[PDB]
């Protein structure tokens, strides 16, 4: 059992190889909006993506990653609850088989159709493999998707998916501007958590935006035509690649907004 989402290797099995799955600071979590406390000490986030250099899109068998050049400080996330500078390395999504499910975080138990994660690492640790071993090593910006109007800045991602249908396929993906994926408002909730796939390391400051972005039915239908399987293997549609909410334990979710 290499892990996945399937009928026999999904999230409820992961603890057998990755015992941290039952740890004290796992992600994702349900955000109870009545219990999250406004923290007037939190700053506006700084999303600095003007110089972002996208390179490649890859179907890794679990999702697809849009990869960036993080060999210098092009695209960075700073401020909000963060100290120091976090470099963008990739974004990816989680989504469902239908619009009623797909997000990993939930909001008062509401599940959104999908969730985008912009993954960043703390440059004080020099590289990503080092950063994931530190409690403050990563900052993941989480943005919910709901189905409604098309998102114009998502269409270049949708259009390339037919070329990376199966696991291990990749394609060029230069000059993509991730600012086209942000909502209007940067209001957010934040809490300390983890990677949501194995190895599930507890190295993430989560920053989850309150305002979802809207994508069209047609756009999310194309996500659901991807495959978990490799070329020539029996087809396993890449859908429901999300981990369910985990116990909040001894953690406080803070709101940036009153």
Ligand X SMILES: NS(=O)(=O)c1nc2c(F)c(F)c(F)c(F)c2s1
Q: Which residues are catalytic?
A: 62
**If you ran DSSP here, which 8-state letter would residue 69 be given?**
-
Return the one option of ligand X, Zn ion, none that residue 195 interacts with (CB less than 5 to 8 A, by type). ligand X
Residue from 45, 139, 140, 203 in contact with ligand X (CB under 6 A): 140
Nearest to 135 by CA among 207, 77, 192, 88: 192
> Looking only at residues 168 through 227 of this chain, which bind ligand X when binding is defined by CB under 6 A?
195-197, 199
Residue from 82, 119, 215, 239 in contact with ligand X (CB under 6 A): 119
28's CB contacts (< 8 A; 6+ apart) are 103, 104, 105, 106, 142, 193, 196, 206, 243, 244, 245, 246
Q: How many CA atoms lie within 13 A of 202 on its CB side?
A: 14
Q: Which two tokens stand for residue 119?
A: 């993954």
234's CB contacts (< 8 A; 6+ apart) are none
**Binding of residue 117 to Zn ion (CB under 5 A):** yes
**Binding of residue 103 to ligand X (CB under 6 A):** no
> What whole-number distance in Å separates Cα of residue 227 and Cα of residue 234?
10
State the minimum distance, in angstroms, from the CB of residue 197 to ligand X.
4
The alpha carbon dihedral of 241, 221, 160, 186 has a sign of negative
State the minimum distance, in angstroms, from the CB of residue 112 to Zn ion.
13
Nearest residue (CB) to Zn ion, 227 versus 241: 241
Which window, 25-33, 50-58, 110-118, 131-139, contacts Zn ion (CB under 5 A)?
A: 110-118
State the minimum distance, in angstroms, from the CB of residue 201 to ligand X.
7
Nearest residue (CB) to ligand X, 122 versus 197: 197
Annotated binding site for substrate: 196-197
Give the interface with ligand X as residue ranges (CB under 6 A): 90, 117, 119, 140, 195-197, 199
């Amino acid at each position: 059992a290499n892990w996945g989402y399937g009928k026999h290797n999904g999230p409820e099995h992961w603890h057998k190889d990755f015992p941290i799955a039952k740890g004290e600071r796992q992600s994702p979590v349900d955000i109870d909006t009545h219990t999250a406390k406004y923290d007037p000490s939190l700053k506006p986030l700084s999303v600095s993506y003007d110089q972002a250099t996208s390179l490649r899109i890859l179907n890794n068998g679990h999702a697809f990653n849009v990869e960036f050049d993080d060999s210098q400080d092009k695209a960075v996330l700073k401020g909000g609850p963060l100290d120091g500078t976090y470099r963008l390395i990739q974004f990816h999504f989680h989504w469902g088989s239908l619009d009623g499910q797909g997000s990993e975080h939930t909001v008062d138990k509401k599940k959104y159709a999908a969730e985008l994660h912009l993954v960043h690492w703390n440059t004080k640790y020099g590289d990503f493999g080092k950063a994931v071993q530190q409690p403050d090593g990563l900052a993941v910006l989480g943005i919910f998707l709901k189905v409604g109007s098309a998102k114009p800045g998502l269409q270049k991602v949708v259009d390339v998916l037919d070329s990376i249908k199966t696991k291990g396929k990749s394609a060029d993906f230069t000059n993509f501007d991730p600012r086209g994926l942000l909502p209007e408002s940067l209001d957010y909730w934040t809490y300390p958590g983890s990677l949501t796939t194995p190895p599930l390391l507890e190295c993430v400051t989560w920053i989850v935006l309150k305002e979802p972005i809207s994508v069209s039915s047609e756009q999310v239908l194309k996500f659901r035509k991807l495959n978990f399987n490799g070329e020539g293997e029996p087809e396993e549609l890449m859908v429901d690649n999300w981990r369910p909410a985990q116990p909040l334990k001894n953690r406080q979710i803070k709101a940036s907004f009153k």
